[PDB]
Amino acid sequence: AKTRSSRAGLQFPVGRVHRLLRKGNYAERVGAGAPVYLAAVLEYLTAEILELAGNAARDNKKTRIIPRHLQLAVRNDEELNKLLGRVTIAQGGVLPNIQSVLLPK
Amino acid sequence: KTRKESYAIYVYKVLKQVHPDTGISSKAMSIMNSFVNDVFERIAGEASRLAHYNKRSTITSREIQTAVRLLLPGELAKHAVSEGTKAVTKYTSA
């Protein structure tokens, strides 16, 4: 007995991704490689966000990632910002940003 | 009674490999779950459209790949296609 995730070197559940692809009515059939590929992509992006958030947590001298750290992580990365350009992270707040014309002399 | 599924244990596993000394609040974990479900739908929906546009009835890893290329910005797309191919390769050798 050996899971497909392990065969691909993944933490993310290949079998579950496969089952979710079948149920989601995306097409009549699902190729055996598609869930392997997608699970990898989902894991990579998860790793990308957790990395930058961990850094965000660390910069704030925290060891526990909270939604604020996720927000800072995403809004400070041009590419993640874009991907989630229409997404709202609850309890994330905004990036510190004051228009320079509003500053004192 | 009925199980509510989640990506949370998988998100946690990945967290311990990238930041082994860092934890994550449950509110932050819920947001990570929304994230994984979201990207899942987006890629799968895009792949779905792709296969229909081409009168194919199977979603293969090729549909996922083109889907990724369409959705992910610049570099993210690059490393995602890379990891996606790595995993499929590794999977086939087994």
Binding site: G9, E43, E48, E51 | Q17, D21, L76, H79, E83
Partner: peptide, 14 residues
């Protein structure tokens, strides 16, 4: 704590 995750993040590739 170094990433022992086997995946190349963008920061890794620099």
């Amino acid at each position: 704590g170094k990433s022992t995750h086997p995946m190349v993040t963008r920061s890794k590739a620099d």
